[PDB]
Amino acid sequence: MNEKIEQAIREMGFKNFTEVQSKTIPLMLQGKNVVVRAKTGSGKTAAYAIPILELGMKSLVVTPTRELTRQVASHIRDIGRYMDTKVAEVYGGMPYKAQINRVRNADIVVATPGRLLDLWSKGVIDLSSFEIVIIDEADLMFEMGFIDDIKIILAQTSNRKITGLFSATIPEEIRKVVKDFITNYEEIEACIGLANVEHKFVHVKDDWRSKVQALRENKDKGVIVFVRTRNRVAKLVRLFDNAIELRGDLPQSVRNRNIDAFREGEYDMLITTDVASRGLDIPLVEKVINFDAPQDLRTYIHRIGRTGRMGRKGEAITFILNEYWLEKEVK
């Protein structure tokens, strides 16, 4: 709301806030830690840059690459053009002297993890001085082999009051880090995934027989079917001879083997509960069937996230008994 920031974004062509921005900004301004599931182009940069500039607290933004470090730093300087703040960039390959001069008296530091820790080790950077810490594209950093750096950074930034982690996906390793380092955080997600899928809703008469019958009408191969409980998965798989199941009590080796059979085309359907498929690598498919409607929109989005093979549009079919709220919200 600072007039200097509002004027700057208006000059940059601001018209409306993106979904990620609308949800994230208010929460960070309230001092809440956030874990945001968002991809490039979602407007995530301004989502954390606005709060950083508005609060005026010394901040650190950790980025995976030199390119992103430069783009983020530039965007922050642009939005904060009238805030008289010093934004410094830190990344590999930069001449040492220039690097030192930039970090000197910086209010906001955007940096790749490796170089940041090197400067920290040499005593050039005081990680305990940062009150806001942002981890941007945590999943990419994990895949690049930087997860231990992220752990050290979060452990050493001992005075951080607001911590935000942005990532398109949340692998188990990242989930662990968030739990051990980010205190009572707000989980934020965009509903963009809804646009890449055709949503179909089938109204059924009851919670079992009519659902079994509706599923028998399925003509497609390589479909994932989500069910509410382990008991229902067990009973459903016993009614279809072209289905393999995933249950929470099956060791991960058995589940991975069942997924392999599905991938090999040995079964037309993979029947699972949300718990049983969580954190497992499953091939992207074209269609998902919600035999049982999910309990909330977030779960719906996560399930339909299983579609989109080869970047194509997906299809989701949900059997609706009395969960009319889902149809309404999705539409």
Short mmCIF file of C-alpha atoms in Angstrom, two decimals:
data_model
loop_
_atom_site.label_atom_id
_atom_site.label_comp_id
_atom_site.label_asym_id
_atom_site.label_seq_id
_atom_site.Cartn_x
_atom_site.Cartn_y
_atom_site.Cartn_z
CA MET A 1 0.00 0.00 0.00
CA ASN A 2 3.04 2.28 0.26
CA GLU A 3 2.28 4.98 -2.32
CA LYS A 4 5.80 4.74 -3.72
CA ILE A 5 5.26 1.08 -4.61
CA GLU A 6 1.74 1.60 -5.96
CA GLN A 7 3.00 4.37 -8.28
CA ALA A 8 5.89 2.22 -9.46
CA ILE A 9 3.74 -0.76 -10.39
CA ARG A 10 1.23 1.51 -12.11
CA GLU A 11 4.07 2.90 -14.25
CA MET A 12 5.17 -0.66 -15.02
CA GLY A 13 1.69 -1.32 -16.40
CA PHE A 14 -0.02 -2.97 -13.44
CA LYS A 15 -3.75 -3.56 -13.93
CA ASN A 16 -4.56 -6.46 -11.59
CA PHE A 17 -2.85 -8.90 -9.22
CA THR A 18 -2.34 -12.52 -10.25
CA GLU A 19 -3.90 -15.24 -8.10
CA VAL A 20 -0.57 -16.09 -6.44
CA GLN A 21 -0.03 -12.40 -5.74
CA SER A 22 -3.53 -11.88 -4.30
CA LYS A 23 -3.11 -14.76 -1.86
CA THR A 24 0.57 -14.36 -0.93
CA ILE A 25 0.96 -10.61 -0.44
CA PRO A 26 -1.67 -10.22 2.33
CA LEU A 27 -0.28 -13.19 4.27
CA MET A 28 3.35 -12.09 4.17
CA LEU A 29 2.32 -8.56 5.16
CA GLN A 30 0.69 -10.19 8.22
CA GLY A 31 4.06 -11.78 9.03
CA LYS A 32 3.05 -15.31 8.14
CA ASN A 33 5.52 -17.78 6.66
CA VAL A 34 4.43 -19.19 3.30
CA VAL A 35 4.98 -22.26 1.13
CA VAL A 36 3.72 -21.43 -2.33
CA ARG A 37 3.12 -23.91 -5.14
CA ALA A 38 3.61 -21.78 -8.24
CA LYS A 39 5.47 -21.89 -11.55
CA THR A 40 7.32 -19.35 -13.68
CA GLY A 41 4.92 -16.79 -15.10
CA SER A 42 2.48 -16.96 -12.19
CA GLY A 43 3.63 -13.55 -10.98
CA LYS A 44 5.37 -15.17 -8.04
CA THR A 45 8.32 -12.75 -8.08
CA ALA A 46 6.17 -9.68 -7.36
CA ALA A 47 4.26 -11.86 -4.86
CA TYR A 48 7.27 -11.82 -2.55
CA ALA A 49 8.99 -8.68 -3.84
CA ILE A 50 6.08 -6.38 -2.90
CA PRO A 51 6.02 -7.56 0.75
CA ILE A 52 9.82 -7.30 0.99
CA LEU A 53 9.78 -3.72 -0.28
CA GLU A 54 6.73 -2.72 1.77
CA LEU A 55 8.07 -4.09 5.06
CA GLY A 56 11.52 -2.63 4.47
CA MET A 57 13.24 -5.45 6.34
CA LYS A 58 16.68 -6.72 5.25
CA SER A 59 15.91 -9.61 2.92
CA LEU A 60 17.50 -12.56 1.16
CA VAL A 61 16.18 -14.26 -1.98
CA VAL A 62 17.90 -17.50 -2.93
CA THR A 63 17.68 -18.41 -6.62
CA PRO A 64 18.91 -21.51 -8.53
CA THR A 65 20.61 -19.83 -11.51
CA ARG A 66 22.55 -16.76 -12.62
CA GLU A 67 19.79 -15.96 -15.11
CA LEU A 68 16.98 -16.05 -12.54
CA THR A 69 19.11 -14.17 -9.99
CA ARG A 70 19.54 -11.34 -12.51
CA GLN A 71 15.88 -11.30 -13.57
CA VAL A 72 14.60 -11.30 -9.98
CA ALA A 73 17.04 -8.60 -8.86
CA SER A 74 16.06 -6.44 -11.84
CA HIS A 75 12.33 -6.89 -11.17
CA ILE A 76 12.77 -5.98 -7.49
CA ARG A 77 14.71 -2.82 -8.40
CA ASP A 78 11.96 -1.95 -10.88
CA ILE A 79 9.12 -2.32 -8.38
CA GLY A 80 11.20 -0.61 -5.68
CA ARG A 81 12.41 2.19 -7.98
CA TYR A 82 11.18 4.79 -5.46
CA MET A 83 12.01 2.93 -2.24
CA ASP A 84 15.70 3.89 -2.11
CA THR A 85 16.82 0.36 -1.33
CA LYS A 86 20.04 -1.30 -2.44
CA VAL A 87 19.54 -4.64 -4.19
CA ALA A 88 22.61 -6.80 -4.69
CA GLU A 89 23.12 -9.80 -6.98
CA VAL A 90 25.35 -12.76 -6.04
CA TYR A 91 26.21 -15.58 -8.44
CA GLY A 92 29.10 -17.68 -9.73
CA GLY A 93 31.56 -16.19 -12.19
CA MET A 94 31.20 -12.61 -10.99
CA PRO A 95 34.56 -10.87 -10.42
CA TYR A 96 35.31 -10.99 -6.69
CA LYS A 97 35.84 -7.25 -6.24
CA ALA A 98 32.63 -6.28 -8.04
CA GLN A 99 30.81 -8.93 -6.00
CA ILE A 100 32.07 -7.47 -2.71
CA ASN A 101 31.13 -3.92 -3.69
CA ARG A 102 27.55 -4.92 -4.56
CA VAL A 103 26.82 -6.77 -1.31
CA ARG A 104 28.27 -3.89 0.71
CA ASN A 105 25.38 -2.21 2.56
CA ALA A 106 22.77 -4.11 0.53
CA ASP A 107 19.21 -4.14 1.87
CA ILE A 108 18.10 -6.97 -0.39
CA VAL A 109 20.38 -9.78 -1.58
CA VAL A 110 19.41 -12.08 -4.45
CA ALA A 111 21.83 -14.98 -4.76
CA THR A 112 22.59 -18.50 -5.92
CA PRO A 113 23.16 -20.77 -2.87
CA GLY A 114 26.74 -21.89 -3.45
CA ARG A 115 28.21 -18.41 -3.87
CA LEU A 116 26.16 -17.10 -0.95
CA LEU A 117 27.58 -19.73 1.43
CA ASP A 118 31.12 -19.06 0.18
CA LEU A 119 30.76 -15.38 1.05
CA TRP A 120 29.17 -16.35 4.37
CA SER A 121 32.10 -18.66 5.14
CA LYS A 122 34.62 -15.90 4.37
CA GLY A 123 32.80 -13.56 6.75
CA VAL A 124 31.60 -11.12 4.08
CA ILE A 125 27.90 -11.86 4.57
CA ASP A 126 26.05 -11.92 7.89
CA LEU A 127 23.23 -14.43 7.40
CA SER A 128 21.93 -13.59 10.87
CA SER A 129 21.01 -10.09 9.66
CA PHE A 130 18.24 -11.20 7.28
CA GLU A 131 14.70 -10.86 8.62
CA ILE A 132 13.01 -12.12 5.46
CA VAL A 133 14.26 -15.17 3.57
CA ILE A 134 12.82 -16.40 0.28
CA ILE A 135 13.70 -19.73 -1.36
CA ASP A 136 12.65 -19.44 -5.03
CA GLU A 137 12.27 -22.65 -7.07
CA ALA A 138 13.17 -25.01 -4.25
CA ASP A 139 12.51 -28.10 -6.36
CA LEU A 140 14.94 -27.01 -9.09
CA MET A 141 17.61 -26.35 -6.46
CA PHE A 142 17.07 -29.82 -5.02
CA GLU A 143 17.39 -31.38 -8.48
CA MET A 144 20.57 -29.37 -9.09
CA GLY A 145 22.07 -30.84 -5.92
CA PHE A 146 21.77 -27.76 -3.70
CA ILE A 147 19.42 -29.03 -0.97
CA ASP A 148 22.15 -29.19 1.68
CA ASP A 149 22.96 -25.55 0.92
CA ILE A 150 19.32 -24.62 1.46
CA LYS A 151 19.40 -26.36 4.85
CA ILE A 152 22.53 -24.48 5.91
CA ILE A 153 21.08 -21.18 4.72
CA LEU A 154 17.85 -21.64 6.67
CA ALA A 155 19.76 -22.79 9.76
CA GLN A 156 22.15 -19.82 9.65
CA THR A 157 19.50 -17.16 8.94
CA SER A 158 18.70 -17.26 12.66
CA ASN A 159 16.78 -13.98 12.77
CA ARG A 160 14.37 -14.54 9.90
CA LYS A 161 10.89 -13.40 10.88
CA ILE A 162 9.21 -14.25 7.59
CA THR A 163 10.23 -17.20 5.43
CA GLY A 164 8.75 -18.03 2.07
CA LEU A 165 9.43 -21.01 -0.15
CA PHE A 166 8.22 -21.05 -3.76
CA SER A 167 8.27 -24.21 -5.84
CA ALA A 168 6.26 -25.72 -8.69
CA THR A 169 6.40 -29.11 -6.97
CA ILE A 170 7.11 -30.33 -3.45
CA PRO A 171 9.19 -33.53 -3.46
CA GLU A 172 9.57 -35.39 -0.17
CA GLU A 173 13.04 -33.96 0.43
CA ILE A 174 11.69 -30.42 0.18
CA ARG A 175 8.70 -31.27 2.38
CA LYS A 176 11.15 -32.39 5.07
CA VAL A 177 13.13 -29.14 4.86
CA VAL A 178 9.99 -27.01 5.12
CA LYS A 179 8.85 -28.96 8.19
CA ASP A 180 12.18 -28.69 9.98
CA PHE A 181 12.90 -25.05 9.11
CA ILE A 182 9.65 -23.13 8.39
CA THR A 183 7.42 -22.45 11.41
CA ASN A 184 3.62 -22.67 11.19
CA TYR A 185 3.39 -21.74 7.50
CA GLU A 186 0.44 -21.02 5.21
CA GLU A 187 0.14 -23.29 2.17
CA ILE A 188 -0.73 -21.38 -1.00
CA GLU A 189 -1.67 -22.69 -4.44
CA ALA A 190 -3.02 -21.31 -7.70
CA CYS A 191 -6.06 -22.79 -9.43
CA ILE A 192 -4.38 -22.54 -12.84
CA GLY A 193 -4.14 -26.32 -13.15
CA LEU A 194 -7.90 -26.23 -13.69
CA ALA A 195 -7.45 -24.52 -17.07
CA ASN A 196 -5.42 -27.34 -18.64
CA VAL A 197 -8.12 -29.95 -18.01
CA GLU A 198 -11.62 -30.65 -19.30
CA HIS A 199 -13.84 -31.22 -16.27
CA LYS A 200 -16.74 -33.67 -16.39
CA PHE A 201 -19.16 -34.40 -13.58
CA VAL A 202 -21.40 -37.45 -13.41
CA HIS A 203 -24.25 -37.41 -10.92
CA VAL A 204 -24.74 -40.81 -9.32
CA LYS A 205 -27.62 -42.20 -7.25
CA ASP A 206 -25.61 -43.69 -4.38
CA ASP A 207 -22.13 -44.08 -2.91
CA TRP A 208 -21.30 -47.52 -4.33
CA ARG A 209 -23.41 -49.58 -6.74
CA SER A 210 -24.05 -46.64 -9.08
CA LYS A 211 -20.38 -45.69 -8.92
CA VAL A 212 -19.25 -49.23 -9.76
CA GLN A 213 -21.65 -49.15 -12.72
CA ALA A 214 -20.44 -45.75 -13.91
CA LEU A 215 -16.86 -47.00 -13.81
CA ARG A 216 -17.81 -50.08 -15.87
CA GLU A 217 -18.78 -47.59 -18.59
CA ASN A 218 -15.15 -46.41 -18.91
CA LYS A 219 -13.69 -47.11 -22.35
CA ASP A 220 -10.24 -45.60 -21.91
CA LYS A 221 -6.97 -47.37 -21.14
CA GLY A 222 -4.25 -46.02 -18.86
CA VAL A 223 -6.60 -44.23 -16.47
CA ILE A 224 -5.97 -43.39 -12.79
CA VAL A 225 -8.95 -43.86 -10.48
CA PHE A 226 -9.00 -42.09 -7.12
CA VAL A 227 -10.96 -43.63 -4.27
CA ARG A 228 -11.75 -42.38 -0.76
CA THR A 229 -10.52 -45.27 1.41
CA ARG A 230 -8.28 -48.34 1.50
CA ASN A 231 -11.36 -50.55 1.95
CA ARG A 232 -12.99 -49.19 -1.21
CA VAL A 233 -9.78 -49.63 -3.21
CA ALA A 234 -9.64 -53.26 -2.04
CA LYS A 235 -13.24 -53.99 -2.97
CA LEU A 236 -13.15 -52.09 -6.25
CA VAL A 237 -10.03 -53.86 -7.53
CA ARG A 238 -11.79 -57.17 -6.84
CA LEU A 239 -14.63 -56.17 -9.18
CA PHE A 240 -12.48 -55.30 -12.21
CA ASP A 241 -10.05 -57.74 -13.82
CA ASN A 242 -8.16 -54.98 -15.67
CA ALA A 243 -7.14 -53.03 -12.56
CA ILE A 244 -4.15 -52.89 -10.22
CA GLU A 245 -4.25 -51.07 -6.88
CA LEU A 246 -2.20 -48.86 -4.59
CA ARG A 247 -3.01 -49.07 -0.86
CA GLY A 248 -1.40 -47.28 2.07
CA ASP A 249 -0.32 -50.54 3.71
CA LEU A 250 1.58 -51.83 0.68
CA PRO A 251 5.33 -51.38 0.97
CA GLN A 252 6.71 -48.79 -1.44
CA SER A 253 8.47 -51.52 -3.42
CA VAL A 254 5.18 -53.32 -4.10
CA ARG A 255 3.48 -50.07 -5.08
CA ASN A 256 6.30 -49.11 -7.46
CA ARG A 257 6.01 -52.59 -8.99
CA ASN A 258 2.25 -52.14 -9.45
CA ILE A 259 2.89 -48.77 -11.08
CA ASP A 260 5.40 -50.47 -13.40
CA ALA A 261 2.74 -52.97 -14.47
CA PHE A 262 0.38 -50.05 -15.16
CA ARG A 263 3.10 -48.31 -17.20
CA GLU A 264 3.71 -51.54 -19.14
CA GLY A 265 0.02 -51.58 -20.04
CA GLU A 266 -0.61 -54.81 -18.10
CA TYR A 267 -3.62 -53.11 -16.47
CA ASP A 268 -5.95 -50.46 -17.90
CA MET A 269 -6.63 -48.77 -14.57
CA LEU A 270 -4.58 -47.79 -11.55
CA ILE A 271 -6.92 -47.58 -8.53
CA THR A 272 -5.53 -45.62 -5.58
CA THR A 273 -6.21 -43.45 -2.54
CA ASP A 274 -4.53 -40.05 -2.21
CA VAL A 275 -2.26 -41.38 0.57
CA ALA A 276 -1.14 -44.47 -1.35
CA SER A 277 0.04 -42.54 -4.42
CA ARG A 278 1.55 -39.58 -2.58
CA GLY A 279 5.22 -39.08 -3.38
CA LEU A 280 5.33 -41.91 -5.91
CA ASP A 281 6.47 -41.54 -9.50
CA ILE A 282 3.51 -42.29 -11.75
CA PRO A 283 3.53 -41.82 -15.53
CA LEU A 284 1.50 -38.84 -16.69
CA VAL A 285 -1.84 -39.97 -18.12
CA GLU A 286 -4.61 -38.39 -20.18
CA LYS A 287 -7.56 -39.09 -17.89
CA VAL A 288 -8.27 -39.35 -14.16
CA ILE A 289 -11.52 -40.62 -12.67
CA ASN A 290 -12.57 -39.46 -9.22
CA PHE A 291 -14.63 -42.51 -8.27
CA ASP A 292 -15.02 -40.65 -4.98
CA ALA A 293 -15.01 -36.86 -5.05
CA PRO A 294 -12.07 -35.25 -3.22
CA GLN A 295 -12.67 -33.53 0.13
CA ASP A 296 -11.51 -30.12 -1.12
CA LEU A 297 -10.45 -28.18 -4.21
CA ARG A 298 -6.75 -28.51 -3.36
CA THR A 299 -6.97 -32.30 -3.46
CA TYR A 300 -8.91 -32.09 -6.74
CA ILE A 301 -6.13 -29.98 -8.26
CA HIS A 302 -3.45 -32.40 -7.03
CA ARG A 303 -5.29 -35.38 -8.54
CA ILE A 304 -5.94 -33.78 -11.94
CA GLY A 305 -2.28 -32.85 -11.80
CA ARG A 306 -1.68 -36.49 -12.70
CA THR A 307 -2.87 -35.75 -16.25
CA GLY A 308 -1.29 -33.68 -19.00
CA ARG A 309 0.87 -36.30 -20.72
CA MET A 310 3.16 -34.77 -23.38
CA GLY A 311 1.93 -31.29 -22.48
CA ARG A 312 -1.54 -32.14 -23.76
CA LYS A 313 -4.82 -31.05 -22.19
CA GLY A 314 -6.21 -33.59 -19.74
CA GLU A 315 -9.61 -34.93 -18.77
CA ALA A 316 -11.07 -35.44 -15.31
CA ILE A 317 -14.34 -37.20 -14.55
CA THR A 318 -15.82 -36.99 -11.06
CA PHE A 319 -18.71 -39.04 -9.74
CA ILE A 320 -20.84 -36.62 -7.75
CA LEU A 321 -23.30 -37.86 -5.17
CA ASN A 322 -23.89 -34.77 -3.04
CA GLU A 323 -20.59 -32.91 -3.52
CA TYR A 324 -22.19 -30.19 -5.67
CA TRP A 325 -19.80 -27.65 -4.07
CA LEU A 326 -16.92 -29.08 -6.11
CA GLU A 327 -18.72 -28.68 -9.43
CA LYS A 328 -19.65 -25.11 -8.51
CA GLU A 329 -16.14 -24.11 -7.41
CA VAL A 330 -14.35 -25.77 -10.34
CA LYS A 331 -16.73 -24.22 -12.86
#
